[PDB]
Amino acid sequence: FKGLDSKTFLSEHSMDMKFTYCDDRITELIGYHPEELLGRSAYEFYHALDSENMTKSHQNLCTKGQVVSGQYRMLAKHGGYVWLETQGTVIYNPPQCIMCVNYVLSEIE
Amino acid sequence: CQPTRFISRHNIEGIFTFVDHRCVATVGYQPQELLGKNIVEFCHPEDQQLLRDSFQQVVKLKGQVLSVMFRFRSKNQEWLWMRTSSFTFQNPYSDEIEYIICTNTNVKNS
């Protein structure tokens, strides 16, 4: 089984939740290629039962600026849902993007 | 435009431990040419101390965003103004030493 560091990866989102960048590491964890994620909303990936909570978590992020998602399912490329927890950090410049540190709770390997 | 920027990760001393390939367009180096070296090595001598003090402080700021502006030496031999925004992450399931996550953008000094 993979340790914590090996189950942690970065993603970056525009304010509408679209992927603008993702670590290569997502591929061994959740199957997606970063290339295929660019331009797609994070929201297209959430289990419907966690959907409500992710919307509130988002709204909280936009007003606080940093927020911990708490536990949620994300649909994996090749079927089934994986448990994650995410820390979100908004980057404002002179809001420019959101930095997500994602940790996969599910057992991997 | 769509201003250019790249993510890097650093240990608390400043060493690049991860670099996103968007660094090629921004500062001209390949990731492998950055990995393993300290960010302070690419920094203008008037800004090195500011950058070292910024690394030191970002760990005291409890995962909060810290921003710094400095001159970074590109592979094209130019001093680029870089705004680096950084924050620490430590997985709360662990007691591993935190590390430092950065986003780096070429900005205007004016």
Ligand SMILES: N#C[C@H]1C[C@@H](Oc2ccc(S(=O)(=O)C(F)(F)F)c3c2CC(F)(F)[C@H]3O)C1
């Ligand atoms: N890989 C991957 C992921 C898609 C998933 O994206 C988020 C997870 C939690 C969240 S969140 O809102 O719960 C958090 F940012 F606070 F963690 C968010 C996102 C995208 C976002 F826009 F940055 C943000 O909505 C992480």
